[PDB]
């Protein structure tokens, strides 16, 4: 047969940077695209689901929404005469 379940928690991450891919398989997106995490078996490998697009996206290149961490980095200095 086939059965099974698991905690009901939906995680939503946001592409921090453009993750280009030479292959179609990989779920490509642009900084901003919001992907819906379905399963997170691996430690740094989860399957994402986009409105039309679908595939697996890197967790090391995305920023979680329900994150409990705070980083300090903005960067500045455009130019100076």
From Swiss-Prot:
Detected in brain. Detected at low levels in heart. It is found in: Cytoplasm; Postsynaptic density. It comes from the Eukaryota. Residues 8-67 form the SH3 domain. Disulfide bonds: none annotated. Changing residue 55 to A: In DEE8; affects dendritic gephrin clustering and trafficking of GABA-A receptors to synapses. Interacts with GPHN. Acts as a guanine nucleotide exchange factor (GEF) for CDC42. Promotes formation of GPHN clusters. It is linked to Developmental and epileptic encephalopathy 8: A disorder characterized by hyperekplexia and early infantile epileptic encephalopathy. Neurologic features include exaggerated startle response, seizures, impaired psychomotor development, and intellectual disability. Seizures can be provoked by tactile stimulation or extreme emotion. This is Rho guanine nucleotide exchange factor 9. The gene is ARHGEF9. The chain holds residues 7 to 75 of 516 of the full protein.
